[PDB]
Tab-separated table of C-alpha atoms and ligand atoms in Angstrom:
chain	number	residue	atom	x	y	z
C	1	UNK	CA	161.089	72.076	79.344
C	2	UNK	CA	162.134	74.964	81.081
C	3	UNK	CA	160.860	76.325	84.635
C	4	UNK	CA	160.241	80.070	82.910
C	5	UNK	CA	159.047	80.125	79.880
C	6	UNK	CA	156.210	81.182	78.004
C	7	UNK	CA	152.406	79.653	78.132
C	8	UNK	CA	150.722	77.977	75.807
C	9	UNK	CA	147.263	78.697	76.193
C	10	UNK	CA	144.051	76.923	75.040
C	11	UNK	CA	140.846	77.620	74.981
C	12	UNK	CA	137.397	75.897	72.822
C	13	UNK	CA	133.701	76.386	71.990
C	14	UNK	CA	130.513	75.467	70.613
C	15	UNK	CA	129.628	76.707	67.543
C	16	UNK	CA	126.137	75.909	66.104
C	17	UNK	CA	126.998	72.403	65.189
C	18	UNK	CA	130.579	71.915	66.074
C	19	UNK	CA	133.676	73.419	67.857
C	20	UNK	CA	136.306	75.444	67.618
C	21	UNK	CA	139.783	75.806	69.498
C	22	UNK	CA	142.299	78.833	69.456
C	23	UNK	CA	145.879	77.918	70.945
C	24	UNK	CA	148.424	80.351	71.190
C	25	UNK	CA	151.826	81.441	72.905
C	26	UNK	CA	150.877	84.154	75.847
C	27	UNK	CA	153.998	86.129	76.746
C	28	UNK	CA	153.958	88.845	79.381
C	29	UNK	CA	152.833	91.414	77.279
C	30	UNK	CA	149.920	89.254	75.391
C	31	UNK	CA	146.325	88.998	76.055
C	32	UNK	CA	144.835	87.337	78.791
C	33	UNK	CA	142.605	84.165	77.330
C	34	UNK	CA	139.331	84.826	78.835
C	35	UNK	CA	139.657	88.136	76.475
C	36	UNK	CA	140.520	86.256	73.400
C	37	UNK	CA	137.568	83.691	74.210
C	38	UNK	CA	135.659	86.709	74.286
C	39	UNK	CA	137.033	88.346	71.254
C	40	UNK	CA	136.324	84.967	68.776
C	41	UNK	CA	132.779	84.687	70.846
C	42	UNK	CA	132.141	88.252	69.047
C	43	UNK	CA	133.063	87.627	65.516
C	44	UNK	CA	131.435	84.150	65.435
C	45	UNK	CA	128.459	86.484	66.732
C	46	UNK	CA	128.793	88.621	63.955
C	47	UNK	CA	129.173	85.732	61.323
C	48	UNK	CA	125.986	84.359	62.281
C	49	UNK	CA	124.098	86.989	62.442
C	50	UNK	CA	124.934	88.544	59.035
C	51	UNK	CA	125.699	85.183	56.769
C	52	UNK	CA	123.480	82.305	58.318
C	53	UNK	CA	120.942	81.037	56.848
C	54	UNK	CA	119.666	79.346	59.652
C	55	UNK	CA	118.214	81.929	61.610
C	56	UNK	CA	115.385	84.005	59.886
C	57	UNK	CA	116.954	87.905	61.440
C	58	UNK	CA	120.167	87.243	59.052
C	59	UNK	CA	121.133	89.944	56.484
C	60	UNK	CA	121.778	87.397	54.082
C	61	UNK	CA	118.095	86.067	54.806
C	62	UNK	CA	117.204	89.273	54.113
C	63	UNK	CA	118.484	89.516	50.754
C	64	UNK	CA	117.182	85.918	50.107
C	65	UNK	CA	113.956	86.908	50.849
C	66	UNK	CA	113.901	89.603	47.945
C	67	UNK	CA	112.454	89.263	44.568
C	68	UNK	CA	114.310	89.621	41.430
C	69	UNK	CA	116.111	92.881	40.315
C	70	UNK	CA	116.550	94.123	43.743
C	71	UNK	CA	119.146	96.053	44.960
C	72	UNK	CA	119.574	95.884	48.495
C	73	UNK	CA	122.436	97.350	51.203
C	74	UNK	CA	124.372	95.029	52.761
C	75	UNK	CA	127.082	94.862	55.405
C	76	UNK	CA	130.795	94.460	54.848
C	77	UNK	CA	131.231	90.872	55.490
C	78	UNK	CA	128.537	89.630	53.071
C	79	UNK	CA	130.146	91.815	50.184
C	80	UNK	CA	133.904	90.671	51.082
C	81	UNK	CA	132.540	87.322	50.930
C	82	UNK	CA	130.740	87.699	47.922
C	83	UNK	CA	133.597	89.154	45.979
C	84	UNK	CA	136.043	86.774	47.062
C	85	UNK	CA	132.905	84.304	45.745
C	86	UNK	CA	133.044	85.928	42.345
C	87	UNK	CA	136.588	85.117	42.159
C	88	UNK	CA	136.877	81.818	43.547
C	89	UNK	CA	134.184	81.301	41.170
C	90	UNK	CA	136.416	82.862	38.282
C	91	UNK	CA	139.368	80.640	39.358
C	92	UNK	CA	137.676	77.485	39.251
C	93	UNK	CA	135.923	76.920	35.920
C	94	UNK	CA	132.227	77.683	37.832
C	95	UNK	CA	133.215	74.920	40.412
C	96	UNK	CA	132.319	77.374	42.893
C	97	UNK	CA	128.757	79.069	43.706
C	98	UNK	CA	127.265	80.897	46.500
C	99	UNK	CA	124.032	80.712	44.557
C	100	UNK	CA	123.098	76.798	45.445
C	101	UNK	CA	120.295	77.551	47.799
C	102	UNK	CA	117.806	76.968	46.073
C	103	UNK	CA	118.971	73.559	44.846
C	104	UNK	CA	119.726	72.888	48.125
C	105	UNK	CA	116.441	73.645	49.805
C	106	UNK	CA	114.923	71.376	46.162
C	107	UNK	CA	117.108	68.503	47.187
C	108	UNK	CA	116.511	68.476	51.297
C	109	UNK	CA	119.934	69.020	51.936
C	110	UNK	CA	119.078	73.034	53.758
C	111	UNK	CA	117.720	74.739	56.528
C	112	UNK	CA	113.995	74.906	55.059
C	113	UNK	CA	114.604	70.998	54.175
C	114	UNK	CA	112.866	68.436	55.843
C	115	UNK	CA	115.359	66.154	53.354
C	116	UNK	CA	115.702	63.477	51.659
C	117	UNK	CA	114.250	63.452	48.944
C	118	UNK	CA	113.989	62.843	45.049
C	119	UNK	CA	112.864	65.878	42.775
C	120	UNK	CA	111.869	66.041	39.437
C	121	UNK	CA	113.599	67.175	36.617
C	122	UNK	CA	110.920	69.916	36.376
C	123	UNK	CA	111.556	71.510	39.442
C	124	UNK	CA	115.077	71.385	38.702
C	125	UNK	CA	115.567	73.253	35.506
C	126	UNK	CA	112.697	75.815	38.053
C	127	UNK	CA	115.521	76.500	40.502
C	128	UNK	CA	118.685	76.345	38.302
C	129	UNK	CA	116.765	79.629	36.805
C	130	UNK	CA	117.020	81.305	40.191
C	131	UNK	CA	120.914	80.303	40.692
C	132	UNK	CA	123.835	81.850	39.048
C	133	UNK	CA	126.785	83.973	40.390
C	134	UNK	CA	126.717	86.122	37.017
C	135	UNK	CA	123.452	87.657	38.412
C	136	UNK	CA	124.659	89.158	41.389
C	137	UNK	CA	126.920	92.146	41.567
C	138	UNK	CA	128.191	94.862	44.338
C	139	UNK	CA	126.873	98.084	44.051
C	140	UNK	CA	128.202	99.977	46.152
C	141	UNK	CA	127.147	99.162	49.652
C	142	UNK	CA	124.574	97.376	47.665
C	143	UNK	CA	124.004	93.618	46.981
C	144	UNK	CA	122.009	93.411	43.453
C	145	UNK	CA	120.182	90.033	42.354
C	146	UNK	CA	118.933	89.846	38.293
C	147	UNK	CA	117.090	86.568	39.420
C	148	UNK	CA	115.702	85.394	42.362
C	149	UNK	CA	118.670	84.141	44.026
C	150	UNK	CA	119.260	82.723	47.271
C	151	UNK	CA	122.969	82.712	48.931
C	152	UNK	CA	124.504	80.172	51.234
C	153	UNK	CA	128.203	81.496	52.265
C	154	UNK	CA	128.667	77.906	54.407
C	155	UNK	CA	131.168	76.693	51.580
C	156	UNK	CA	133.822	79.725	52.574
C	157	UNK	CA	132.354	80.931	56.268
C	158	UNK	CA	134.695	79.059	58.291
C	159	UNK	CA	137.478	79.801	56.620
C	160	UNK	CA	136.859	83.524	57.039
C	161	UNK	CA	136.058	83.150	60.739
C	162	UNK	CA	139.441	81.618	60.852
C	163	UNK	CA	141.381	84.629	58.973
C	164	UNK	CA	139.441	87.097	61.290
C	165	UNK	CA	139.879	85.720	64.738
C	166	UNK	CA	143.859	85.777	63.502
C	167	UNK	CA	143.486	89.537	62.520
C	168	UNK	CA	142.451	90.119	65.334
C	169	UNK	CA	145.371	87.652	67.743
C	170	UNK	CA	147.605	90.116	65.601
C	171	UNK	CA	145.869	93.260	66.418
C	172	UNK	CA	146.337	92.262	69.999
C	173	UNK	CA	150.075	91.265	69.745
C	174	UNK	CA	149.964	87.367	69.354
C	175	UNK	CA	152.363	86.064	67.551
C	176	UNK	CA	152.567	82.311	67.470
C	177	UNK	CA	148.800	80.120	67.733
C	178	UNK	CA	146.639	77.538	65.903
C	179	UNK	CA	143.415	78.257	65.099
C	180	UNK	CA	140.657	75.492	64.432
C	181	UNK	CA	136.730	76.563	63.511
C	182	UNK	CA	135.002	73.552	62.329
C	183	UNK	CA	137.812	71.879	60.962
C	184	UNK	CA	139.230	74.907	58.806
C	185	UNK	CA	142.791	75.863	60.127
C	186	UNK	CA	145.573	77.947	60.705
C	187	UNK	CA	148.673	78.107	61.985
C	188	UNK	CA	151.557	80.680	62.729
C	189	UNK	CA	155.042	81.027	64.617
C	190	UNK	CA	156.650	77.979	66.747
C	191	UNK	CA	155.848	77.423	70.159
C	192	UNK	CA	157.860	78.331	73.164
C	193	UNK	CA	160.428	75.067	72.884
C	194	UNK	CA	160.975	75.811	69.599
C	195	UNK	CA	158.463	73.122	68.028
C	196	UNK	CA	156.122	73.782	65.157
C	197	UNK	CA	152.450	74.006	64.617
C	198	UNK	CA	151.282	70.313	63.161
C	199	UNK	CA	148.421	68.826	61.406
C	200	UNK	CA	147.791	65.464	60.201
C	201	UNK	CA	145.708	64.681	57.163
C	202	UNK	CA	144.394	61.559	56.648
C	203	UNK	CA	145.805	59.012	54.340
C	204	UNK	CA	144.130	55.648	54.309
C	205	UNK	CA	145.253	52.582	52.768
C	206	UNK	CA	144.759	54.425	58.298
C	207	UNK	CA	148.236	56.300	57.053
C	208	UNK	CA	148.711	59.923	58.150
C	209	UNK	CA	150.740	62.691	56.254
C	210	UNK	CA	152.402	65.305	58.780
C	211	UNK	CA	152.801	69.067	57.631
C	212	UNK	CA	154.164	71.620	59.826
C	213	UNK	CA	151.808	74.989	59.283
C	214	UNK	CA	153.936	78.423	59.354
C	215	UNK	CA	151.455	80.981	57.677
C	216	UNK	CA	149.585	78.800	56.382
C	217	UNK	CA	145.842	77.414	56.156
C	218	UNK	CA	143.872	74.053	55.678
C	219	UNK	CA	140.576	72.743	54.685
C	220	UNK	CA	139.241	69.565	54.076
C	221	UNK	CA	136.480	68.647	52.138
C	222	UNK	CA	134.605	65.144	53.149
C	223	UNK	CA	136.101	62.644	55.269
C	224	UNK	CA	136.851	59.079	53.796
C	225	UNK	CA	135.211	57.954	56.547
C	226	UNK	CA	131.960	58.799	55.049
C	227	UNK	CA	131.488	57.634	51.618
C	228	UNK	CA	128.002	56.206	51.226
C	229	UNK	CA	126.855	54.533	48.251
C	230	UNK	CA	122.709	54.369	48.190
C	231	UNK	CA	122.076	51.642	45.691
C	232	UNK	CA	125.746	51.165	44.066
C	233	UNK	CA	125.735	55.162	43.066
C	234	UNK	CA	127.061	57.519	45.559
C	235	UNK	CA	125.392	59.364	47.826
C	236	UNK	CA	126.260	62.880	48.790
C	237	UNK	CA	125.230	66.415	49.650
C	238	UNK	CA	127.627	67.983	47.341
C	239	UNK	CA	125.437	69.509	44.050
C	240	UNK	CA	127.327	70.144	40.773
C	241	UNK	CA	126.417	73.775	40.136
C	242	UNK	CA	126.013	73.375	36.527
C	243	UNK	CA	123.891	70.378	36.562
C	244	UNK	CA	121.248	70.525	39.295
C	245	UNK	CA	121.703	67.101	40.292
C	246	UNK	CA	124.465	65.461	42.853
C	247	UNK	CA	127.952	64.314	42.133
C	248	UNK	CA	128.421	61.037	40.941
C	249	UNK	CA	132.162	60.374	40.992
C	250	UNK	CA	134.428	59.041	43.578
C	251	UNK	CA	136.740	61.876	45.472
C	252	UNK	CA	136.174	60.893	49.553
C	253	UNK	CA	137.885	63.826	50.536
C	254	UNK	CA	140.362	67.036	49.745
C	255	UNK	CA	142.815	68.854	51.681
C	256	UNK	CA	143.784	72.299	50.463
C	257	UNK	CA	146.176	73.840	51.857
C	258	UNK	CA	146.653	77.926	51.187
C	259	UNK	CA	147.771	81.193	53.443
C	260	UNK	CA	144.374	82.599	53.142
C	261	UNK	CA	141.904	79.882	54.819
C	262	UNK	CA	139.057	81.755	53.026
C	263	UNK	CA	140.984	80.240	50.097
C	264	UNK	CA	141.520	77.097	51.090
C	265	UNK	CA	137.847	76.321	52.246
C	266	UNK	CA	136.250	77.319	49.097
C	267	UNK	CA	138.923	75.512	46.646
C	268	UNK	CA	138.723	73.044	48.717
C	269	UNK	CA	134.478	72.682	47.826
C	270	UNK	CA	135.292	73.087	44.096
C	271	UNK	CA	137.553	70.494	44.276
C	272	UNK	CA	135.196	67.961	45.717
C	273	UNK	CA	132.472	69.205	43.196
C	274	UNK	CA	135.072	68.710	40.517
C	275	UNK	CA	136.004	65.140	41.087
C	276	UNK	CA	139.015	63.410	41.295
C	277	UNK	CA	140.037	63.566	37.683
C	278	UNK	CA	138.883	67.260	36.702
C	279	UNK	CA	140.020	68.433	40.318
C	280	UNK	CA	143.828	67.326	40.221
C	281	UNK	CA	143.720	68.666	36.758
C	282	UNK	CA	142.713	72.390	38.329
C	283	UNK	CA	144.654	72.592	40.591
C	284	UNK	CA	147.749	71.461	38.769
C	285	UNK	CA	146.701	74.500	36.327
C	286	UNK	CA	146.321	77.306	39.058
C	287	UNK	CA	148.939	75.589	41.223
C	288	UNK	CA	147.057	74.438	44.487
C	289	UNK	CA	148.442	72.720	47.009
C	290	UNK	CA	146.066	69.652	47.668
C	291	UNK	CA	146.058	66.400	48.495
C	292	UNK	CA	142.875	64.042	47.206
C	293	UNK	CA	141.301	60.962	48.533
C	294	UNK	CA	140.047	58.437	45.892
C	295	UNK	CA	138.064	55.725	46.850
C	296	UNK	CA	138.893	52.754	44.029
C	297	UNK	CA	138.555	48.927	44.403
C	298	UNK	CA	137.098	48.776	47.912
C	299	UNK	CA	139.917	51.132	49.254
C	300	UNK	CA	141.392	54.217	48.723
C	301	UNK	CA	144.046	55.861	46.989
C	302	UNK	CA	145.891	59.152	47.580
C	303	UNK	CA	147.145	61.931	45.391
C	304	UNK	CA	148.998	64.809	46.027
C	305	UNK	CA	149.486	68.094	43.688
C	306	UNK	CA	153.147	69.354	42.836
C	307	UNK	CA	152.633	72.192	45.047
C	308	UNK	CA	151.854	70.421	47.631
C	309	UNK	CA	155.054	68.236	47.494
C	310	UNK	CA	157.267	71.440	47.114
C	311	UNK	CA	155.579	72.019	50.628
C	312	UNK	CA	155.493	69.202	51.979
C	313	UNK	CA	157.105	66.472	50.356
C	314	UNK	CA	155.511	63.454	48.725
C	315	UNK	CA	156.309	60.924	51.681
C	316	UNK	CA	154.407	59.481	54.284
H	401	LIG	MG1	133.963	74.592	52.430
């Protein structure tokens, strides 16, 4: 290195369960970092407070709390969320649903869950009558529901918060950074020595597949780490939307990798719903740059799209 030259600044957080961390290149114009800490405190205020489900003041809670055929207003966020929803939904086959809750509070795995446990196949065919995207629709500054449903943005959230704290390093003049909330990334610009922004996905055989991010975002679905099987069938929180009941098949873990991060961390859940097989098919069709983890014969195996070698190559 050089004796002037610019900083590279870092700062991280708590979130409600996790952490984040914002890096970026500070030159003499650029913003101090106590102001950007500030500035991602606020929208991660604002994300919470509108779209969580855990805390009972939400404006999403609000709209879950409503009975069928309502039309309620609703803020910005929740509709630019649930319209990118409708489309990520659109995009892959149904994969995707904002509408789980319900099955998700059924099967323990929510925030009015005291958990695990077994439910009937009564109370599921109940609350797959209060799910389905079809039934809701902007209005609007209105959010209307033709069933009971209940939202749960948790599948796409951090990805926003990702694409808005960068709106906002550009507002204020930033140029190069990496962004992490919760594991969803992004990355812009090189740093001061001329370097790139890296990641490493996971590759087990404990392999690791570099990618240098310019513009670009990343999510990752499960972590090979934890695959559990509870008696010889596999255990998970993930629901198939069109069947009430858990996934069965064997995909550990997916890495999508997209320039919009809201992107990548909903594909991203619809290819872990989807599986292995019809997930690789999908996203050859729309062209998604992923790269699976398959758990086979006491191991794992690893697949990567053809978009994603064009990107990246298919080396490790
Ligand atoms: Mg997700």
């Amino acid at each position: 290195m050089d004796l002037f030259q610019d900083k590279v600044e870092a700062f991280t957080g708590p979130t409600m369960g996790s952490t984040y961390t914002v890096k970026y290149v500070r030159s003499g114009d650029g913003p101090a970092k106590e102001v950007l800490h500030g500035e991602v405190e606020a929208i991660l205020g604002q994300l919470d407070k509108q779209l969580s489900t855990y805390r009972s003041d939400s404006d999403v809670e609000r709209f879950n709390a409503l009975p069928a055929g309502s039309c309620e207003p609703m803020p910005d966020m929740v509709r630019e969320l649930v319209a990118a929803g409708s489309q990520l939904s659109a995009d892959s086959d149904g994969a995707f649903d904002l509408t789980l809750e319900p099955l998700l509070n059924l099967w323990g795995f929510g925030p009015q869950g005291r958990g695990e446990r077994v439910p009937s196949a009564e109370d599921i065919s109940a609350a797959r009558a209060l799910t389905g995207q079809q039934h809701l629709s902007i209005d609007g500054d209105r959010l209307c529901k033709a069933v009971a449903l209940q939202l749960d943005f948790n599948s796409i959230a951090a990805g926003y918060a990702v694409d808005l704290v960068i709106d906002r390093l550009k507002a204020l003049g930033v140029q190069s950074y990496l962004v992490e909330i919760t594991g969803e990334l992004k990355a812009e610009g090189r740093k001061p020595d001329g370097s790139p922004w890296r990641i490493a996905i996971e590759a087990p055989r404990v392999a690791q597949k570099i990618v240098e991010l310019d513009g670009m975002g990343v999510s990752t679905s499960g972590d090979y780490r934890n695959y559990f099987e509870r008696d010889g069938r596999r255990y998970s929180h993930t629901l198939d939307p069109q069947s009430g009941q858990p996934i069965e098949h064997h995909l550990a873990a997916v890495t999508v990798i997209d320039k919009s991060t809201l992107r990548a961390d909903g594909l991203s859940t619809a290819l872990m719903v989807l599986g292995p097989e019809k997930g690789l098919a999908l996203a050859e069709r729309n062209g998604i740059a992923a790269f699976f983890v398959v758990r086979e014969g006491q191991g794992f195996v690893t697949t990567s799209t053809k978009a994603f070698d064009e990107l990246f190559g298919a080396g490790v």
